[PDB]
Design a protein around this ligand. Structure first.
Ligand SMILES: Nc1ncnc2c1ncn2[C@@H]1O[C@H](COP(=O)(O)OP(=O)(O)OP(=O)(O)O)[C@@H](O)[C@H]1O
Ligand SMILES: Nc1ncnc2c1ncn2[C@@H]1O[C@H](COP(=O)(O)OP(=O)(O)OP(=O)(O)O)[C@@H](O)[C@H]1O
Lengths: 518, 528
């Protein structure tokens, strides 16, 4: 039922899997020209929840539909278990021949852990002969095509070590657990009478942090199930269905949100729904400046730079590391990010801090371009020992000059107050230091539109009130603004069940005048 | 016998279970359009003695004598094992087929771990064969409709994960320890058929005390008290070989019997651990209940999540009082105990250093991650004036940087107490607590009425029982002369007066010790 249309996000995995597995089986005479000798053993491995067997079934559909030029047999290495001496043994030679009498073919082996476990002194002589003669079945009945052994498992070490030898089972395909999620939401709701809004589904996928595929459909089914709970609360404690129209179970804005809150669900995090219209301008500005310094976000017509470096400096309480920098990291996605802070350096024992400080830089060198994050450099410099500072400096210096790896750091004290070793590390004469500024008047004006007023009247003079709140908030930092918002929004809850107005507005207007934060 | 009546306190897993057993048999239409396909395997788990077998017995009786007809089939741990090589796996299939031929039926398995262990290569192969042949015919349950198999176990871990899969066992029910309202129902249930029915106010007065008990513990004390009353009424029976004569009507159960019965018993869950929470003793309650109330209402004002959705923003608070004001030894345990149902993780010197082989930063890491996992949660840090001047700078930096990562609106409270005032407190800590948040409380000395009530029980009520105005004068002068004392000194004076009262237990006339009482009352001197 799936022909590469119920798969979301896997734009690059498909190209690799088809080119090195199916195409050599789809076009075997081509590789006779150069003698590539493609491997005869392939695997699907990764964390659970990646949907490994469905890909094999899709390959079966692709190969079977047509002229039957390449085939596929579906097999499981966990239901192929026979409690007899050698009866499950014939399954592979017949299968490696049944798929060979009608070759080419791809044979899937789900959970080979049971059919071919680790033969040992505790395992049955049955399974001992099974595994021995079984590896004899595969390494002997291969090496000329056109059978490519594809298997799946949850753990890589759950395989008999004699299987993974030269000239035997070799290849491994990494399946991992957000760009896939838009495609997933598009696909899995292909036939829905209450078709949700595209922004509705995008918010759904945004709020489904940590889910991998199956639970993505599970939440949708659960949302429908609780929709018929909420629209029809009388389903409990009622007689047989007498009059129920099964069309008012339509999913609206609040249905999935009440559905999401009924189960438990990196230094990059976008702003909240309340914070976005306050710092979005500054995030865009810093992104633009970074574009200017860092062009990656002999021969010409190729981007090049000289040691990408940048420092965020702002007065404490300006949210330069509390809200800005993780947001910038989130905005500059599709690049590897690697932090270096105290709980990641001292948070693991059985290792010297020097032992991990080299691994991050080495592996970020491997995957250039990469991002290294060092928050609160003004305090991180005074916690490490004398050797760590020197090791950090030498590791940073050993980078190539034209390597497009960016150093991102944030600070609280002004640049002129830092230790001198930091000072002769940034080039303020260049574009390497960015300043954070207080929000302007429009942002503060638009920060209070929702509560004043789009929900208070939900079942004048307050406008003067409104401007007074702004008339005092010219020079308050982010934390004071947000705490003020929370304290005002509390009173709105305080009189939910008071239809009579002019008494709640009195208490709001007297609390705002009473709010002293000098 | 029992029909869903004696089972009280849950009231929620019964509704979802008749929907499993009865509703599909009566309403085969709601499951038609939506393709509901209700699940067929339930997995009872939880700490022992909280149910999960009483429910099975109630269900068995309900289906035996409810809507005819449903059959009950049950095993005891591991009975499929036989001596021969073929009957070990054949009896299972035989009884399973016998159950299928008797549709409809219900299958009950208890002690799953005794028949379905965790498969591995470090154990015998016969168990591997039996678990495989068990999960074989279980997977083919869709074809053999109207067959439901349920399981009762105690250890979640000791089950092979291969069975805990959609297709075999996709549903689990957790049976945890009961709460106050549920305990009241349990006490009402187990004393139901008592001829002098006790009054309800006594029942929840008692149920306030029971904090760690379960079903079995609650049941047992109702027999312990009866035997204690039996002993109290007729203490001539034990040292006797021959039978005697009893009237059977002089026996009556009083509150003292319950008190002494609870004295010797120990809660089942606390036979290997002591929780970091205590409630005020009876002698102290009329001296700090008001302040516990005021702290509770203030924290409710700042942290309203304990009253569509209340909003909170990094709730914090710090109780500050003089050294002798009992802020770290009485008030904080009271606050932690009055806010039940909240998982609280503590953090003090016997926690960071009280454990070996683990550097303090590691322990802080597990603590903070597990406090974020189950929110709302409480972090306990007592004596912050001392916890801070002993730890290394690295630990301070880790502690400060690891709580800045929290979601702003999460209902996570920081709880701490101090002995020095806020101003003298280290400045680099004072940024965590800001006055406009209302995070600062000052414990004050109790007023005149509180002392008057505190000493009112000793005099003049205890000094009146055989084995008046002068006592009023003595109370007056004592209440006057203790107007500048802290909690420790007050309870010390209480103790010395009580001891002097004890020392004249056998004096048959008063007025011989009133002069004593007054004389050591003057002999008291503390001066802080
Ligand atoms: N990434 C995914 N995309 C789509 N469907 C998925 C995904 N992951 C899981 N599913 C669905 O949930 C089911 C559970 O996956 P599956 O059991 O095959 O994975 P697993 O956790 O490795 O378990 P096991 O190997 O024991 O079967 C799949 O059969 C499929 O229906
Ligand atoms: N909610 C309850 N109401 C009344 N009695 C209860 C309750 N929970 C437990 N009990 C008492 O506990 C007794 C036995 O408990 P039960 O066998 O149900 O526990 P279990 O956790 O399944 O046992 P175990 O783990 O030891 O196998 C019951 O006979 C009953 O007296």
């Amino acid at each position: 039922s799936v022909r590469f249309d119920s798969v979301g996000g896997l734009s690059n995995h498909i190209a690799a899997l088809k080119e090195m597995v199916v195409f050599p089986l789809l076009y075997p005479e081509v590789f006779e020209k150069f003698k590539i000798q493609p491997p005869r053993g392939c695997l699907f491995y990764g964390p659970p929840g990646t949907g490994k067997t469905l890909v094999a079934r899709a390959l079966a559909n692709e190969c079977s539909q047509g002229d039957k030029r390449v085939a596929f047999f579906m097999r499981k290495g966990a239901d192929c278990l026979s409690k007899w001496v050698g009866e499950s043994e014939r399954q592979l030679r017949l299968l490696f021949d049944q798929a060979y009498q009608m070759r080419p073919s791809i044979i899937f082996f789900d959970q080979i852990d049971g059919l071919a476990p680790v033969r040992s002194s505790r395992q049955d002589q049955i399974h001992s002969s099974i595994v021995s003669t079984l590896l004899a079945l595969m390494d002997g009945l291969d090496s000329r095509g056109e059978i490519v052994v594809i298997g799946a498992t949850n753990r890589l070490d759950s395989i008999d070590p004699a299987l993974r030898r030269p000239g035997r089972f070799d290849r491994e395909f990494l399946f991992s657990l957000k760009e896939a999620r838009k495609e997933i939401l598009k696909i899995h709701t292909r036939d829905w009478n209450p078709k949700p809004l595209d922004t509705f589904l995008e918010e759904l996928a945004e709020n489904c942090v940590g889910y991998c595929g199956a639970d993505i459909k599970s939440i949708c089914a659960e949302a429908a199930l609780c929709a018929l709970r909420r629209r029809y609360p009388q389903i409990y404690t009622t007689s047989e269905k007498l009059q129920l129209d099964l069309s008012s179970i339509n999913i609206s804005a609040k249905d999935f949100e009440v559905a999401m809150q009924k189960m438990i669900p990196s230094p990059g995090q976008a702003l909240s729904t309340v914070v976005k219209p306050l710092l979005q301008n500054t995030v865009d500005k810093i992104l633009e400046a970074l574009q200017r310094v860092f062009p990656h976000a002999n021969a010409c017509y190729q981007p090049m730079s000289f040691r990408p470096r940048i420092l965020i400096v702002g007065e404490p309480g300006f949210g330069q590391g509390s809200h800005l920098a993780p947001a910038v990291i989130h905005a500059l996605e599709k690049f590897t990010v690697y932090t270096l802070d105290i709980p990641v350096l001292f948070g693991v024992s059985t290792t010297s801090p020097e032992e991990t400080c080299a691994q991050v830089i080495r592996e970020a060198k491997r995957t250039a371009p990469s991002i290294v994050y060092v928050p609160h450099i003004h305090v991180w410099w005074e916690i490490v020992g004398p050797t760590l500072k020197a090791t950090f400096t030498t590791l940073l210096q050993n980078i190539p000059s034209f390597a497009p790896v960016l150093l991102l750091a944030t600070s609280d004290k002004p640049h002129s107050a830092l230790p001198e070793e930091v000072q002769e590390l940034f080039i303020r004469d260049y574009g390497e230091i960015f300043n954070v500024q207080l929000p302007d008047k429009e942002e503060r004006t638009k920060f209070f539109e929702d509560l004043i007023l789009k929900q208070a009247a939900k079942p004048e003079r307050l406008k003067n009130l409104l401007k007074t709140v702004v008339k005092k908030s010219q020079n308050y930092n982010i934390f004071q603004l947000e705490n003020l918002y929370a304290v005002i929004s509390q009173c709105i809850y305080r009189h939910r069940k008071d239809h009579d107005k002019t008494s709640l507005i009195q208490k709001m207007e007297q609390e705002v005048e009473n709010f002293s934060c000098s």
